[PDB]
Amino acid sequence: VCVEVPSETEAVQGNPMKLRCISCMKRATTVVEWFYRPEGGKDFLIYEYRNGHQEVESPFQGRLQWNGSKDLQDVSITVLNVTLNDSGLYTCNVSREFFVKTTRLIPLRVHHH
């Protein structure tokens, strides 16, 4: 069955990081938006599912990898090759029609070694 599990919030520099986002659903059109915000900055979109997985232009374009389910209850993504600079707040927005909308916040912090 579908369990809602929070994402890890600590990442090791140089490894891939899974930004977990799970929205267990009510027995359906889906939109998923992933946002990132650097310390002292503004949210910008980095990943989108909106009638398909869209190419989103961002500093993240190139290092993102989809890691979710086909049923779209798991909408996790992976950031490849993590740097100290990827620290910040990641937001996962999942909306569902035929209405719902759920938000998940990931205060991501990257470490050495």
Author numbering: 1 to 27, 32 to 102, 110 to 124
What does the paper say about this structure?
The structure was determined to a resolution of 2.5 Å, with phases obtained using the molecular replacement method. The β3 Ig domain assembled as a trimer in the asymmetric unit. The β3 subunit protomers in the asymmetric unit are related to each other by a pseudo 3-fold NCS axis. The total buried surface area within the trimer is around 2565 Å2. Potential N-linked glycosylation sites of each protomer point away from the trimer interface. Key features common to all Ig domains are present in the protomer. These include a buried disulfide bond (Cys-21–96) that stabilizes adjacent faces of the molecule and the presence of Ig domain-typical β-sheets. Instead, the region is held in place by a surface intramolecular disulfide bond, Cys-2–24. An intramolecular salt bridge between Glu-4 and Arg-115 further constrains the local conformation of the peptide chain. As a result, the side chains of residues Val-3, Val-5, and Pro-6 are surface-exposed. These residues from each protomer provide the main trimer-stabilizing hydrophobic contacts.
The vertebrate Nav channel is composed of an ∼250-kDa α subunit, which contains the ion-selective pore, together with ∼40-kDa β subunits that modulate the voltage sensitivity, gating kinetics, and trafficking of the channel. The Nav β subunits (β1 to β4) are related to the L1 family of cell adhesion molecules and are thought to possess a single extracellular V-type Ig domain, connected via a stalk to an α-helical transmembrane domain and an intracellular carboxyl-terminal region (4–6). The Ig domain contacts the Nav α subunit and modulates its gating properties. Here, we report the crystal structure of the human β3 subunit immunoglobulin (Ig) domain, a functionally important component of Nav channels in neurons and cardiomyocytes.
